[PDB]
Structure formats: structure tokens, C-alpha cells
Amino acid sequence: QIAEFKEAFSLFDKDGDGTITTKELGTVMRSLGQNPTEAELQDMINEVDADGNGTIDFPEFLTMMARKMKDTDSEEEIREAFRVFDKDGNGYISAAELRHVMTNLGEKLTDEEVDEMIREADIDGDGQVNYEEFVQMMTAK
């Protein structure tokens, strides 16, 4: 709870001012555990207080989390997902195909986000990924 989260907050505070930049709201939520979309963050970064604010304190954030808790919790449910590239039902997809789905489809990720992700994803010597194991690792928490 709040002790691990305070240590996460104290790592996001870099200046040591007690307050983190409002831009780093969606990384702090995600660091604690949650997954939120960057739309959901925009719909709860707005306020009359935090919309006007340049930085946010740990009491403010704890207040935001309490207000939006249900929606915020709803982001942690997803453990199962389905994806094609595999049509033949091998259970495997290439790293090229994974990069194409992540960077070319949906909200779109960057290549740097995908390159970051493939530092904590098993990839065999063929260059393929078991996508059932990959979904389990990403949801793992």
C-alpha cells in the first residue's frame, strides 16, 4: 500500500520538492500497478485544481486515486487476450509481427517502447515469441 507507493512517489520526485510534474501522472499510476489509457488520465487530470496545477503532491494523487478508484481498478482485470498473425495456430509469432501490431495498430506504441519491452520478454534463437507466455508475463503483477 502507501509505503511502497510513497517510495515510488519519492523516486518520481527528482527535485525533492514534494511534488511531481503533472505530465508524469500516467507513469506514476502505472508504476503503482494500474494500466490506464492516456485518455483516462486526461479525463481525470482535468479538474479545476490539478488542471491548473503544474505539479502534484502525494496527498493530491491519493485523493485522485480515491475518486477514480473503480475505473482505475478496472484497468487491472485483463489477463486474457486474443491476437492473430499466427493463422495456423502454432502459438508463436515473430518479433517483426509483434512490432507491427504494437507500433502500427491500435493506439500505436513507439519502437523505443517495443525495444524496451523486449528486454523483459523471452525471445527464442529463432526470433519468435510464445504469445501465451508473453501475455502471462505482461499481466504478471
Binding site: A8, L11, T27, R30, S31, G33, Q34, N35, P36, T37, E75, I78, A81, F82, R83, V84, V101, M102, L105, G106, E107, K108, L109, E113, E116, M117, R119, E120, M137, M138, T139, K141
Partner: protein, 49 residues
């Protein structure tokens, strides 16, 4: 739509996984720093011990 929703969930989860890894790595470096530092407080051990 269902394929697009499955892709958005995948990249939201990936974004939530990445930051946790990046935080975890930062904590590993920060943990090393504060132990390395406490051991080099043993200049004390040379100076009076």
C-alpha cells in the same frame, strides 16, 4: 472493433509493464548506491577503529 480493442489492451498493458520494469531497474541502481555509500562510511573504521 474487437481486434482493435484487443490491441489497445495489449499496448496499455505493455505501457503499464514498461514503467514497472523501468522503476524496478531504477530501484536496483538506487539500492546499490545507498549500500556502496554506507560501506564507504567505513573510512570511520580506518580513522578510529
Amino acid at each position: 472493433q474487437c481486434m482493435r480493442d484487443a490491441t489497445i489492451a495489449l499496448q496499455a498493458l505493455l505501457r503499464g509493464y514498461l514503467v514497472r520494469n523501468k522503476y524496478q531497474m531504477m530501484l536496483r541502481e538506487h539500492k546499490s548506491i545507498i549500500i556502496q555509500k554506507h560501506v564507504r562510511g567505513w573510512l570511520a573504521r580506518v580513522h578510529y577503529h
